[PDB]
RNA sequence: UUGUCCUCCCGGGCAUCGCCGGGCAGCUACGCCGCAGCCGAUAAGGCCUGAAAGCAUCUAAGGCCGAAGCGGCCCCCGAA
């Protein structure tokens, strides 16, 4: 183990609700709903005061990788919740 | 229609079916009719999101397309 555990945050915004059930993230804002199920064996995403929190115990560094990758990804639903997203293309 | 025999005529036997021309039915080909391009998942490859590695990155987790190849539609045998 690369630690004795790991914990990522993702702060919430005011305009912004997150719930977690399971392995199911839910991010409710005020342009829409987002879900996704987010699984890896050993962690466990919870809320916490006004964070989310991804959190394991003597992680490895897949685990770690995993981790990070979820909290990148929570953090695109909020993102896209509370401004979205565009792309621009050129003919 | 040739040779021969039944005496001759008609009518017949044999000579590869005696030989030659034609020939329906049947069988045949050299004849004629019939043989779908659509769904699903993939290989190489082309991409999205994304960290490990505050950036970057098609890959590590996740997702989308993608072959005369693979599975189904189709045909034949099939209640030991």
Same mark, same amino acid.
């Given at each position: #183990?690369?630690?004795?555990?790991? !914990?990522?945050?993702?702060?919430? #915004?005011?305009?912004?609700?997150? $719930? ?7 991010? &409710?804002? #005020? ?15 919870? $809320? ?10 003597? #992680? !490895?560094? &897949?685990?770690?990788?995993?981790? !990070? $990758?979820?909290?990148?990804?929570? !953090?695109?639903?909020? &993102?896209?919740? $509370?401004?979205?997203?565009?792309? &621009?293309?050129?003919?």
């Amino acid at each position: #183990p690369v630690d004795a555990w790991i !914990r990522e945050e993702v702060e919430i #915004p005011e305009g912004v609700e997150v $719930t977690v059930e399971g392995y199911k993230v839910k991010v &409710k804002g #005020p342009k829409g709903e987002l879900e996704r199920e987010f699984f890896w064996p050993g962690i466990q995403i919870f $809320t916490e005061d006004g964070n989310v929190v991804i959190y394991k115990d003597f #992680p !490895r560094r &897949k685990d770690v990788a995993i981790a !990070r $990758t979820f909290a990148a990804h929570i !953090r695109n639903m909020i &993102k896209g919740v $509370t401004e979205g997203f565009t792309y &621009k293309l050129k003919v």
